Amino acid sequence: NLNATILGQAIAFVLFVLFAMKYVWPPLMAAIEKRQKEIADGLASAERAHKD
């Protein structure tokens, strides 16, 4: 008898905001630093390598 939609949508938006943001965020960041830190890390250690 009450509007009642936005309540459920909102709570699901809370718990699910947590679960989802949590799930994707760490992987994508580790992908960022994975990439920059990848071409990077290789280049640097390899620079020590070549130079030395």
Binding site: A46, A49, H50, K51, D52
Partner: protein, 52 residues
């Protein structure tokens, strides 16, 4: 870096090796001569003291 280093050490090593190899060979020659010479001087003293 890696393959380079390998060849560099390996090389300068080997170069040293043949270098000394020759050096000892030649030294062996100077010995060989000065030996033969020594023999000659021997022959000389021989004849001299003799007809003397």
């Amino acid at each position: 870096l890696d393959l380079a280093k390998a060849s560099a050490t390996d090389q300068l090593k080997k170069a040293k090796a043949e270098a000394q190899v020759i050096i000892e060979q030649a030294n062996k020659r100077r010995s060989q001569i000065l030996d033969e010479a020594k023999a000659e001087a021997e022959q000389e003293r021989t004849k001299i003291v003799a007809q003397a």
